[PDB]
């Protein structure tokens, strides 16, 4: 998940159920957004007119929702996560000392 220069590692079932407008793929001109109602609400219709406003930025909402997730970065177009736990088993048979003579 790339938000804006902020990057995270995100589970799929939670990402599918994010109540915000979305479109599947990349762009090729005018992407079609779905559930646009998520960020726009109509209120107080009076017989010839109903007011409609945008909800505002959901930066803090998702950043709070992502609290405790596995973090990551991106640069060079391919750089990625800061996580470890690499189990290795290594042999040093062909490893000789230098300068014993």
């Amino acid at each position: 998940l790339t938000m804006n220069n902020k990057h995270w590692l995100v589970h799929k079932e939670w990402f599918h159920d994010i109540p915000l407008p979305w479109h599947a793929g990349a762009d090729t001109g005018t992407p079609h957004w779905n559930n646009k109602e998520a960020l726009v609400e109509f209120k107080d219709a009076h017989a010839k007119r109903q007011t409609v406003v945008v909800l505002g930025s959901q930066e803090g909402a998702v950043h709070t929702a992502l609290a405790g997730a596995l973090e990551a970065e991106m640069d060079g177009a391919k750089g990625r996560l800061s996580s470890g736990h690499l189990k290795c088993r290594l042999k040093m048979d062909k490893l000789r000392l230098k300068g014993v003579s």
Partner: protein
């Protein structure tokens, strides 16, 4: 009031799961919430607490730095994201109202819970061995013999005796779950001592998930 948990399942040491609790039947945005664990056959253990507004969070030291609790009061959903899972985290996870009142608290209502299983091995067949008496107590010539089914991965194991001929006196026991991550099981039958030299004793073990059918000369 209904607290429905989900998002669990079978995981392997390391990695992450994210548990979610959907709440209904009450004003979710006004109550504190907490997660509580119960390992198979063990007691209860508090995991983490979150306040009504979410400003204050608490964690048990056995989970600190690895778990993190979240809230979404607009959707009435409680979250517990667990990172770096260990075998100690194998338990049933309950979502519960952790109320706050003037000098009174408590876990008022509980959900039915969701199972979270951390395990390292993949899938494994069993090895069957006999259990002969070698002693003869001769209390109405009653000798007891059986077979142990050791180190299988999936719990389904069906045990028969003499291909269904032996039904009287059969006792198949519930399995153990060892620190190796595998299950072991035993089955025993009590038989008249007058049959030690006449009746051929045979145990029929079938482990369907790994396609093993082992019949041992018990």
């Amino acid at each position: 009031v209904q607290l429905v948990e989900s998002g669990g399942g079978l995981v392997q040491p390391g990695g992450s799961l994210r548990l979610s609790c959907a709440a209904s039947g009450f004003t979710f945005s006004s109550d504190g919430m907490s997660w509580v664990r119960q390992a198979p056959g063990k007691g209860l253990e508090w995991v983490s607490y979150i306040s009504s507004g979410g400003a204050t969070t608490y964690y048990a030291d056995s989970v600190k730095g690895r778990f993190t609790i979240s809230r979404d009061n607009s959707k009435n959903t409680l979250s517990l994201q667990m990172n770096s899972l260990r075998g100690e985290d194998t338990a049933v996870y309950y979502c519960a109202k952790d109320i706050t009142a003037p000098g009174r608290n408590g876990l008022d209502s509980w959900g039915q819970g969701v199972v979270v299983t951390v395990s390292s091995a993949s899938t494994k067949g069993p090895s069957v061995f006999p259990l002969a008496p070698s002693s003869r107590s001769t209390s109405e010539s009653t000798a007891a013999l059986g077979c142990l089914v050791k180190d299988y991965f999936p719990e389904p194991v069906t045990v028969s005796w003499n291909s269904g001929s032996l039904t009287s006196g059969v006792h198949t026991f519930p399995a153990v779950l060892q620190s190796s991550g595998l299950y072991s099981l035993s089955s025993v039958v009590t038989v008249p001592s007058s049959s030690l030299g006449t009746q051929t004793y045979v145990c029929n073990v079938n482990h369907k998930p790994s396609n093993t059918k082992v019949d041992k000369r018990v």
